[PDB]
Amino acid sequence: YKLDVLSSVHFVPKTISMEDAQPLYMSNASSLAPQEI
Amino acid sequence: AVPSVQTFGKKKSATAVAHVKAGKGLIKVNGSPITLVEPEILRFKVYEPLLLVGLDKFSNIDIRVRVTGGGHVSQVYAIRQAIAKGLVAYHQKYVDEQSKNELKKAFTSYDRTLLIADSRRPEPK
Amino acid sequence: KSDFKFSNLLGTVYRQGNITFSDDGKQLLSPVGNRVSVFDLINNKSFTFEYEHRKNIAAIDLNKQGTLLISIDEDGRAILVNFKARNVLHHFNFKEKCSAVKFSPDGRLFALASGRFLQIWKTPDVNKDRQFAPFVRHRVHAGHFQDITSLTWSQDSRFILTTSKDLSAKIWSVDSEEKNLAATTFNGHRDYVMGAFFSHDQEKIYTVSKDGAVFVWEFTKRKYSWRITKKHFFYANQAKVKCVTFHPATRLLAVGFTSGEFRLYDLPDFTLIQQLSMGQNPVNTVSVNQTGEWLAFGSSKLGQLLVYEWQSESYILKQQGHFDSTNSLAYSPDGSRVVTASEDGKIKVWDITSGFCLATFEEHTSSVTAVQFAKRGQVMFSSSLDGTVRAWDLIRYRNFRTFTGTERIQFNCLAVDPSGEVVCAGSLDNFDIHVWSVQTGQLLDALSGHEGPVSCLSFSQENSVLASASWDKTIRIWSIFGRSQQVEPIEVYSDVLALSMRPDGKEVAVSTLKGQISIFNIEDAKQVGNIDCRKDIISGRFNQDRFTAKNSERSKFFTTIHYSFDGMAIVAGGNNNSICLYDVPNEVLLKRFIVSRNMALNGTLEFLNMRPEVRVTSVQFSPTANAFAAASTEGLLIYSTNDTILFDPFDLDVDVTPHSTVEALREKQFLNALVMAFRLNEEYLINKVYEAIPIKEIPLVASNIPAIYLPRILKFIGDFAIESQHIEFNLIWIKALLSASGGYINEHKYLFSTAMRSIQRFIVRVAKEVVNTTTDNKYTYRFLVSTDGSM
Amino acid sequence: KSNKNFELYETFMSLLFKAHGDVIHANNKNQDIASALQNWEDVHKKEDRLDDLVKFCMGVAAFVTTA
Amino acid sequence: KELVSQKNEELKLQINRVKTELRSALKSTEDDLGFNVQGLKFVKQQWNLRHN
Amino acid sequence: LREKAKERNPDEYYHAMHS
Amino acid sequence: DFEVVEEFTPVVLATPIPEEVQQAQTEIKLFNKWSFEEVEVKDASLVDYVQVRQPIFVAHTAGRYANKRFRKAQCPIIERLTNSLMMNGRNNGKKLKAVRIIKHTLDIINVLTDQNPIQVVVDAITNTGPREDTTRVGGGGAARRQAVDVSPLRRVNQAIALLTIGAREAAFRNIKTIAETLAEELINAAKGSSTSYAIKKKDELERVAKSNR
Amino acid sequence: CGNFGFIGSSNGSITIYNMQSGILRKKYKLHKRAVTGISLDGMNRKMVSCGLDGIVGFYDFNKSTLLGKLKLDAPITAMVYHRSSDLFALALDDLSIVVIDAVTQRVVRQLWGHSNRITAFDFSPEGRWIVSASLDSTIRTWDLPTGGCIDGIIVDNVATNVKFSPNGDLLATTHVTGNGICIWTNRAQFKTVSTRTIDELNDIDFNTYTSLEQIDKELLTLSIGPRSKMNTLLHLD
Amino acid sequence: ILLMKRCRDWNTNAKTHTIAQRTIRCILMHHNIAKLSEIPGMVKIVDAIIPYTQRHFTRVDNLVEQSYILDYALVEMDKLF
Amino acid sequence: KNSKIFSPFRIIGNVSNGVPFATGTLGSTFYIVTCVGKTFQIYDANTLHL
Amino acid sequence: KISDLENKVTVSAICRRRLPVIMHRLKMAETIQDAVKFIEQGHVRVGPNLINDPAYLVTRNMEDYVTWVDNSKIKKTLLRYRNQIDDFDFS
């Protein structure tokens, strides 16, 4: 962070839990490669 | 103090420096007028920069062109390049930009070797 | 034809401020950046409001009739919007800092947290016309010692609870005639009181503090006034209360702490209904429905938004933008979804019919550069600065190849031929063009040739030639297939960025650094024309300058170009806040849009009397939707068009009127009525005559249709059949159309390309899904009857 | 029967089948459920006309676009 | 583009015959495939409904 | 001096180069 | 009725430009004598392989016309003519000599038979270029011929090569020289007289193709 | 595009000057009496001259030829151009308004109704309405799709000039008296308004058409509403 | 279960495939479903059966979708004369 | 007479007609109040906004 | 160098990537005292885009392209003193 802010043109900003970043809602191991299965 | 502009053009080794400034029509190559270009058979190759656009775009200017180096036909290609890009630079920065890119569209519609040269050498197959 | 309104805003789903539901739970509206957005949560869609504050936005609400929104920025620039038609209505300036606004439940009045004071205003009306001075200040109150941190309204319009950073929570009456009822000042909390709420029966007042205290004030005895009958504690370890709300009609108190946690309670007994956590960064605002079911949260550090149904503990939407990053985009060649690729280093796959991030792809370490689809849009690619490019599919949603150089070199751009075999990428500090085979993930060749760094690539789509372009002022036409590897250089005047190629594969458009666009034929090498574009972009005067606001060549060039799929319009954007779009055959600007007016962004306006800076990095046209996406510093920007209000007909004359079309329809000359409405080119007339043509002559009209309205008819049938309902009627129309005139579009392939994409992604998005569902129903029936299991 | 909300009725029936169609398969060929889903499929088997229509239209669209 | 422009009633009858019998064969084998995959997914899902 | 000519660096500028 | 005026002063530059030059500034004629307008290719299948849609001033447009496969079919037909004519052992790189003898050549085909010389050279190309041809089929060693056809690029190339080498063979060392013998051979090939070397070779090639087809 | 000024004289000479230096660029001369209306497309590809001998000239202006010369049967006071929909409206002196398009050159709408000299045109920015103010002290709003009036405001003073906003909410009308410029706010973009001819099928009246729920019984529909509801319902476990 | 192992072996092709699908059809329509569920270890091979027959289902679906160009050629040959 | 599309909003560019404008004090900001033809306007006397 | 990054990368090296001292080592200026004046007046681009803050660290792969912009007084007087002012491309 401190290196590319020094060396970049534009600025760079930077119990029970969950997660908002996922591959897909719908597929969910019902989309697997048949060669791998 | 007159509005002058200066451009460069070059084929293989010849070099042509052109000074376009607000004058009254005269067009000179090493002092000698444009009617007398040496190889005598490419005189229209040096004419067609001032023949695609009409002489009324040359009524207000005058062009003195020094030319050194290169052979005969490389010299006359250098003069046509210097004439064309000097005219479009003078119209770029002393009269209207619509006339500038109208001239540039006319030259790049005739052939764009009148303006910039393929100056990058060969392919190693 | 260039009537590009600003329709949607994908990306950055919440930035700063307080999320609010509508009068019902159907429309969740959120303070994204400068503007606001509205997500329709039942008819699942999204739009973004067309207005724009002058700074970042700070507080939003809409009144309980749902017909009037007010947003208010960080300084006092109140925008009042008639909500049900998206027209800006009034432009007021409050004189100082605002903290939170709140409409009264009847809708007559609203209240405003103006620092240490409190403002009380009555709203204007929306039935009567535009006034001039419509804000009548009702009353100010000045009883505090420090700034107000929140307000809550009573159920009736009589009392407000003003909770502040000074430890008082004060109850204030709305009219002075009954002021002697309760003007009292509940003290008692240790540090800051951050909420105060009435109960349903307004005899109990809860007050919630910073450290996690809940105080229940009640009017009991020891005339006799307002003692504290019950104290509750949250007992988070070092997580103070960051936001609160309390829906009284179901007694639900939602409290989000400053460590990504939120709990929520049934308050009068104080039982912990539900406790969970969102991240390692504080939840900033909460909101409830009117009916207690939906419950939405907004975390401001990463900029993510939750909604929650807590009866059946499940969500409806869960999105997350980025923190100041959108580095490229790409559509799919069936225009139904759009990949954005974010400079934090992660890929997102939005869908344009919804507004939801249906997929993240968190794989890359360092920054990402560009994305590019191939093979009808179910294989995409992504190039990083980490040192690799990599493939993805959009069926399994997984990598399958990680192409890399053996040298740890970053990349800048990439492209891929339509016959999905080879993948080219273009770096910054080894001057080459690498190509990999996508069948076997190896490096095919180090296809050199330039003298400097390359900046922008594209493969063709008809001959699949490569067209690289590099900072040696040179573009370079490559033919890499079939025993030859033919090179052909073309030499531009100045430095070169930003290549794009026409979708018929006959010419290539390139930007320059000397503020110009050129187009080059590629079976030849002569030009066609150069659009001069250095007089019609307005970069902003920076706050770090000595120079002027126009002469400084800051971003007087175009960092990204794209063609349109008809072949004429070119859209172009640069590091300045101006999006231009041109056409090639006349070399003139169709239009110029400013992208933003945030003076928080530094180089935004022209006359301002490090920083985030406004920038546009990738622009593309839609393959079907007649919209274009920009990838700004804010997020994805979607400017859409329509066949609506612009009245742009096609060779009408004196007799063709909508009355004449509808009387020809009732006199049943259906083909004459259809061409009489398409000459007029108006939305309701086209839709009416198209629905009201009955079924027994669809072969007659689709055979005797003219040969010049057919791309318009195909484009309309597609863009009506996507969001239509009559799928068998649409399928009958398309069957008749491309059975009667099938060979003609095949001999005139190119001008039907922006229509034949539409009716093919009409089929593979809804119709084939419905048909495989009824296929599965038929097969499950056939199984459950044909076999016999009686245990 | 009435051709309205066709995708919703198809997904309702498939939701029924994959939710608790196991009892349907188990005491299959009882007279009540046999005639019930027999007339259901006597109505449902007309609904492959749009199957024939999309298998026409997607193939002809791909053909007249590509070749 | 020449197969359209040909003029042969015998050839177009032959095309109709080939078309209807080929689509009958392909819909038959697709019927077999779909009935098998739905019966097998029922078998697996009720096994998991027993003791997942 | 031939080596400095082959590395001339064509963008040098001082106050003394006005005349 | 309709009128457009653009220039208003009589434009005369301070250097006196010749009147033929400022007449040519209206419409570009070849060598300031011959209009590329009203030149049509009376045959089909050789349009867009001859190129008479660009009025040039002199056949010396020295752009790069050979670093692609088919992009030597767009430089104009008389520039390809003078460039194919320039080559022998006595002359390579003598292109101003080649241009001056093509200038004398088209001047005297004007003074003999005034259609216009570029029209004469274009339909001379079309009548010259052969249409069927023979190749050596392998057969293990048997000298059997076989009949093929020729693409229009091959027709135009072999046409300009046959015209040039026919003028070479017709003024190797006898009375005339290359200029007037190219004139006479080219007007014979333009008329279709079957007295020129070009149509003799075309008839011979098509005759052996017709024979062992 | 701002690089060309067009001037129409009292002897038919329309002179086209370049702008940012002031030198003359070209000079068209078609009319033989004076010239009253000049305009030009966004594409710099079709310009229109409109002279009160009664003739309208369609020129190319990227070449310098003309390619159309329509004649009319009245003198012409004024002209206005809607560039977004290639249309342009003409006053006449049989008191008609004739709007014609600059591509197909037909006489596409003939609008009667006024009773004196008309003195103000403007096209609304969406191209659906024109507003004309006329010396019988009236202001009429013509909808050219139906080719008919919508309302006629009888303002007491004669309205001199009528312009629109770039985003069609404001009318700026000046009258013959009163120093200031009167401003009118429409109720146009707030709700659709009727299309009914006044003097002294409700779908096409109010310019909108809702989709009916189904055509007939044997034509399938889908779920009237969203499309992800089916996928959520099939996969929500 | 031995024949089912042979069927799972045969299923992952495109030539030996319709044979496997009609074998599993005849077993599935001529046996007991609770028998086929409580045969020991007979889910560990039908879970490998189902994606291959799903892939073949989509492949034959795409081929029978592509087969309508003969219908298009028929309607165009009817439109010719 | 009465319209149906355009409601009249504000005469702009007019600050007086000849009627004597009046003045007064709204507490702090002195306001002048002028007559224009049919309607009246109110201006501030510190910034001369309206 | 792998483990001896403990001793060499100091202030005198981490400030040697700065655009003033890279400018002075590229001999684009007399000294830092007016190199900061040039790059604060906004005459100096690196890559395609202009850079104004005089604390920028030009990287390894951008040291080759830290050159003056077109249309600037110093580029004009440099080409005037060399007498090669090709005035077609703006200067």
**Measured between alpha carbons, how far is B66 from B49 in angstroms, rounded to an integer?**
17
CA B48-B51-B54 angle, 5° bins: 160
H or E element that contains H163? strand H159-164
Helices C768-786 and H228-235, packing angle to 10 deg: 30
Using CA coordinates, name the residue in chain G closest to C479. G68
Q: What is the DSSP letter of H212?
A: P
Write the CB contacts of C80 (distance below 8 Å, at least 6 apart in sequence). Answer: C68, C69, C70, C88, C89, C90, C91, C92, C124
What does the alpha-carbon distance between residue K57 and residue K63 come to, in Å, rounded to a whole number?
10
What is the spatial distance between Cα G123 and Cα G121, in angstroms, rounded to a whole number?
Answer: 6
Does any CB of chain J come closer than 8 Å to the CB of residue C129?
Answer: yes
Residue type, H98: V
Asked if residue B46 lies in contact with residue B83, where contact means CB atoms within 8 angstroms, the answer is: yes
Beta bridge partners of J11: H182
Which residues, in sequence order, are CB contacts of C287 under 8 Å at separation 6+?
Answer: C18, C19, C20, C21, C245, C295, C296, C297
Is the Cβ pair D65, C735 closer than 8 Å?
A: no
Contact C742 I72 (CB under 8 A): yes
Task: Report whether C360 contacts A23 (CB < 8 A).
Answer: yes
Tell me, what amino acid is at C488? E
Which has the closest alpha carbon to C255: C205, C214, C198?
C214
Tally Cβ neighbours within 10 Å of residue C268.
Answer: 14
Q: Tell me which chain K residues have a C-beta less than 8 angstroms from the C-beta of C544.
A: 52-53
The answer to whether C132 contacts J7, with C-beta atoms less than 8 Å apart, is no
Tokens standing for residue H21: 């230096």
Q: In which residue are the tokens 């309390």 written?
A: C246
Contact between H48 and H31 (Cβ < 8 Å): no
Q: How many CA atoms lie within 13 A of C29 on its CB side?
A: 23
Residue C131, CB half-sphere, CA atoms under 13 Å: how many? Answer: 14
Distance from D2 to chain H by nearest Cα, in Å? 6
CA distance to G46, G157, G160, G210, per residue, from G205 (Å): 19, 15, 16, 9
Contact E44 I46 (CB under 8 A): yes
Q: Residue E11 corresponds to which amino acid?
A: L
The residues facing C517 across adjacent strands are C511, C531
Q: Is H210 helix (H, G, I), strand (E, B) or coil?
A: coil
The answer to whether residue C649 neighbours chain B at the CB level (below 8 Å) is: no
Helix axes G152-170, G197-211, angle to 10 degrees: 130
* Strand partners for H110: H98
CA distance G55 to G39: 11
Task: Give the burial string for C563-572 (b: 16+ CB within 10 Å, else e).
Answer: bbbbbebbbb
∠ Cα C172 C176 C177 (to 5°): 125
In order, the DSSP letters of C474-491 are EEEEEE-SSS--EEEEEE
> Would you list the domain boundaries of chain B?
1-125
Amino acid at C327: N
- Asked if residue C574 lies in contact with residue C762, where contact means CB atoms within 8 angstroms, the answer is no
Residue of I nearest to A36 (CA): I48
- Report the alpha-carbon distance of residue C86 to residue C69 in Å, rounded: 10
- Length of chain A (residues): 37
Whole-number Å distance between alpha carbons of H72 and H95? 13
Q: Please report, for residues C385, F9, H127, K42, K76, the alpha-carbon distance to residue K91 in angstroms, rounded to integers and kept in the order given.
A: 35, 18, 46, 17, 6
Distance, in Å, from the CA atom of E17 to the CA atom of C660, rounded to the nearest integer, reads 48
Which residues from chain F sit within 8 angstroms of residue K81, using beta carbons? Answer: 17-18
CB contact (8 A) between residue I72 and residue D55: no
From the CA of C492, how many Å to the nearest CA of chain B?
8
Indicate left, alpha or beta for C11 from its phi (over 0: left) and psi (-120 to 50: alpha).
left
Estimate to the nearest angstrom the gap between the alpha carbon of G117 and the chain centroid: 10
Nearest to G17 by CA among B36, B83, B57: B36
How far apart CA C126 and CA A19 sit, in angstroms, is 42
Give CA–CA dist C56/C115, Å, rounded: 18
**Coil, strand or helix at C240:** coil
Question: Following DSSP, what letter does each residue of chain J receive, concatenated?
Answer: ---SSEEEEEEES----SS--EEEEETTEEEEEEEETTEEEEEESSS---
- The residue whose two tokens read 């939405």 is C296
Pairing relationship of beta strands B61-68 and B27-29 according to DSSP bridges = parallel
Return the closest-CA partner of residue G124 out of G9, G14, G37, G42: G42
H37 C-beta neighbours (distance < 10 Å), count: 22
Please spell the DSSP secondary structure of K14-81, one letter per residue. HTTTBHHHHHHHTTSSS-HHHHHHHHHHT-EEETTEE---TT-B--STTGGGEEEPSS-HHHHHHHHH
Report d(CA D6, CA H206) in Å as an integer. 32
> How many beta-carbon pairs below 8 A join chains A and I?
9
How many other CB atoms are found less than 10 A from the CB of residue K88?
Answer: 23
Interface with E, mutate which of C780, C781, C784, C785 (most E CBs under 10 A):
C780
Locate C75 and state its tokens. 């300084």
Nearest to C782 by CA among H45, D41, J39, J42: D41
Do residues H48 and H79 touch, judged by C-beta distance below 8 A?
Answer: yes
C223 CB-near residues (< 8 Å, 6+ apart)? none
C-alpha pair distances (Å), A8 with each of A5, C325, C384, G140, K58: 5, 14, 16, 71, 8
> Residues C556, C603: contact at Cβ < 8 Å?
no
Residue ranges of domains in chain G, CATH in brackets = 8-213 (1.10.455.10)
* Of C591, C562, C565, nearest in space to C579 by CA: C591
DSSP label at residue A26: S
Residue C374 has φ and ψ, to the nearest 5°, of -165, 150
What CA–CA distance (Å, rounded) separates D42 from C540? 70
- In DSSP terms, C390 is beta-bridged to C382, C402
Tell me which residue has tokens 């900046």.
C455
What is the length of chain E?
A: 52
Q: Cα distance from E4 to chain C (closest Cα, Å)?
A: 10
Chain G interface, best mutation among B56, B58, B63, B65, by max G CB count within 10 A: B56
Q: What experiment produced this structure?
A: cryo-EM
Chain H (215-234) residues lying within 8 Å, Cβ to Cβ, of chain D:
217-224, 229-230, 233-234
Ramachandran angles phi, psi of H40, nearest 5°: -160, 140
Helix (H, G, I), strand (E, B) or coil at G210: helix
Chains with ≥3 CB–CB distances under 8 Å to J: C, H
- Nearest Cα neighbor of C711 from C776, C758, C665 is C758
* C727-740 helix and I69-80 helix, angle to the nearest 10 degrees: 50
SS (H, E, C) C623-684: CCCCEEEEEECCCEEEEECCCCCCCCCCCCCCCCCHHHHHHHHHCCCHHHHHHHHHHHCCHH
CA atoms within 13 A on the CB side of B59: 10
Please identify which residue in the block is written with the tokens 């789903």: C13
Q: Class of B1-125 per CATH?
A: alpha beta
Distances (CA, A) of G158 to B30, D41, G133: 45, 75, 11
The C-alpha atoms of residue E45 and residue C36 are separated, in whole angstroms, by 46
Chains sharing 3 or more CB pairs under 8 A with chain H: A, B, C, D, G, J
Q: What's the sign of the alpha-carbon dihedral D58, D60, D63, D64?
A: negative
Residue of chain K nearest F7, judged by CA positions: K26
Can you tell me the distance from the alpha carbon of C204 to that of C208, in angstroms, rounded to the nearest whole number? 13
Using alpha carbons, select from J20, J13, J50 the residue that is nearest to residue J35: J20
CB atoms within 10 A of CB F2: 5
Q: From C171, C143, C139, select the one nearest C158 (Cα to Cα).
A: C171
Q: Are strands H181-186 and H97-101 parallel, antiparallel or unpaired?
A: unpaired
Q: Provide the sign of the torsion angle of the four alpha carbons B103, B106, B110, B111, taken in this order.
A: positive
In H, minimum Cα distance to A26 occurs at H235
**DSSP code, position D19:** H
Residues 6+ away with beta carbon under 8 Å from I51: A32, A34, A37
Q: If you search the block for the tokens 């707030």, which residue do you land on?
A: H190
User: Do residue E18 and residue I70 have CB atoms under 8 angstroms apart?
Assistant: yes
Q: Do residues G166 and G183 make contact, with C-beta atoms less than 8 angstroms apart?
A: no
User: What is the structure's resolution, reported in angstroms to one decimal?
Assistant: 6.0
CA distance G84 to G101: 13
Using CA atoms, how far apart are residues C693 and C666, in angstroms rounded to an integer? 10
